[PDB]
């Protein structure tokens, strides 16, 4: 008859989805773009030629210092200031709420018409393919399985085996 489920912060999950899959937009075409044999072959002897490696897990700091700065300072001030204490405007804070941010403060505001509104027209682009990313990297992020799993010979683990026709990997297409 139906679940009392809609989170109220059901509003948050979705701008958490603009995260996961717009971000995963920068994966589908850089990966499956490849360039097969551009001319041919990658040769990467450069910042990794001969200086005792380069990254790996000093990669993580240099990667996620300013991604720490990027992601960190994102949802914190997407909009919300005011931020204090006592009573509810319902999500699980909304202490900004009725207050935009500052009474008579500065230029807290982006743009005219007493709001944060970047006008009403732009439902066209970011509704379809951009949240399509959600429903695309859903099964095309679940091509993950098909692309590698089956562990190209080398490794069978707790040998049950249980079947044998032929291998499985990735390249595009398929037998049949």
């Amino acid at each position: 008859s139906d679940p009392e489920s809609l989170r109220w912060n059901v509003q948050a999950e979705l701008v958490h989805s603009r995260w996961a899959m717009l971000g995963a937009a920068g994966i589908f075409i850089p990966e499956f773009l490849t360039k097969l044999g551009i001319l041919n072959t990658p040769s990467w002897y450069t910042a990794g030629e001969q200086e005792y490696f380069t990254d790996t897990t000093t990669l993580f700091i240099v990667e996620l210092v300013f991604i720490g700065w990027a992601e960190g300072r994102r949802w914190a001030d997407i909009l919300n200031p005011g931020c204090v204490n006592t009573d509810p405007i319902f999500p699980n804070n909304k202490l900004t709420g009725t207050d935009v941010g500052y009474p008579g403060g500065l230029w807290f505001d982006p743009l005219g018409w007493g709001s944060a509104s970047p006008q009403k027209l732009k439902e066209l682009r970011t509704k379809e393919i951009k949240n399509g990313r959600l429903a695309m990297l859903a099964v095309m992020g679940a091509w993950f399985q098909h692309i590698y799993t089956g562990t190209g010979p080398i490794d069978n683990l707790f040998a049950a085996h249980l079947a044998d026709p032929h291998a499985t990997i990735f390249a595009a297409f398929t037998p049949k």
Binding site: G37, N40, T41, P42, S43, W44, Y45
Partner: peptide
Amino acid sequence: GVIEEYLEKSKTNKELNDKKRLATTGANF
């Protein structure tokens, strides 16, 4: 990894391969 020549000299090859008589199956029978 680390590469020296040339992802190959002669590219990937005889690992699917069938070609002149792609036969087995369509054929056998």
